[PDB]
Swiss-Prot record:
Domain of life (superkingdom): Eukaryota
Species this chain originates from: Homo sapiens (Human)
Covered range of the whole protein: 363 to 624 of 624
Name of protein: Ceramide transfer protein
Annotated phenotype, changing residue 111 to A: Reduces affinity for membranes. Abolishes ceramide transfer
Entry comment on modification after translation: Inactivated by hyperphosphorylation of serine residues by CSNK1G2/CK1 that triggers dissociation from the Golgi complex, thus down-regulating ER-to-Golgi transport of ceramide and sphingomyelin synthesis.
Any one GO CC term of the record: endoplasmic reticulum membrane
Length: 236
């Protein structure tokens, strides 16, 4: 890349690829808090200074869409308001490359506390597969950065995030005279979110909100990708 965040991007993508994909099923520091269909949501309970930082990991498997498609929809700001429900306002502060932008946004008061905002680089990348036996990996990383055109606000508490949507497409081609269809593909999703609320809120409540809001998002977002791609040629 050309832009000034290229090194930080790679580090984030590499850290997600080595640590965020790690298996969490039989990890005793992780608790399965939500299950529904192919969807599972785990959390690790962590606090620093009485502030709840609980890392969150969700895994999902969505029939009929590719990882490329799910990442595309996740990243594309032009469709954000079609699925995202926790945001008051947002805008793009800077475009760094074709695949990388910085975004400022304010969240609805889902917490018993002052309104939060967040300012983050949002980048979409493909990680090539080592062999053709393996899926390519598409990832969108959303992580907090600073920018001059969005200094600390005086009304909102500035949250800090490290988030990734990581997707791999499994294909199961049919045996006969038929071409691959969407009935023959399945997107495996790992979604990780590490959010620093930027100040105190009662923990019991933050965990309630996380338990409620992440699975809601993943269902509506994934369903929306299924809707928008249905009947359309497959983008691997
Ligand atoms: C900082 C105040 C956020 C309040 C918590 C709301 C739970 C969010 C569930 C859905 C996240 C969808 C989600 O990942 N949204 C992205 C597009 O808006 C930005 C994002 O990567 C982010 C993740 C977590 C918190 C804030 C932004």
């Amino acid at each position: 890349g050309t832009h000034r965040f290229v090194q930080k991007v790679e580090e984030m993508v590499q850290n997600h690829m080595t640590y965020s994909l790690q298996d969490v099923g039989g990890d005793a520091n992780w608790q399965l808090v939500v299950e529904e269909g192919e969807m599972k949501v785990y959390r690790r309970e962590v606090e620093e200074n009485g502030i709840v930082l609980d890392p969150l990991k969700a895994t999902h498997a969505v029939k009929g869409v590719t990882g490329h498609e799910v990442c595309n929809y996740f990243w594309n700001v032009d469709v954000r308001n079609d699925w995202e429900t926790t945001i008051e306002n947002f805008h793009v502060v800077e475009t760094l490359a074709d695949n990388a932008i910085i975004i400022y946004q304010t969240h609805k008061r889902v917490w018993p506390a002052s309104q939060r905002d967040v300012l983050y680089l949002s980048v979409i990348r493909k990680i090539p597969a080592l062999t053709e036996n393996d899926p390519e990996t598409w990832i969108v990383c959303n992580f907090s950065v600073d920018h001059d055109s969005a200094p600390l606000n005086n009304r909102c508490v500035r949250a800090k995030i490290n988030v990734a949507m990581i997707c791999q497409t499994l294909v199961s081609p049919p045996e006969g005279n038929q071409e691959i269809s969407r009935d023959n593909i399945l997107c495996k999703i790992t979604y990780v979110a590490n959010v620093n609320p930027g100040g105190w809120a009662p923990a019991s409540v933050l965990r309630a909100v996380a338990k409620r809001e992440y699975p809601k998002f993943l269902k509506r977002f994934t369903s929306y990708v299924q809707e928008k791609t249905a009947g359309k040629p497959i983008l691997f």
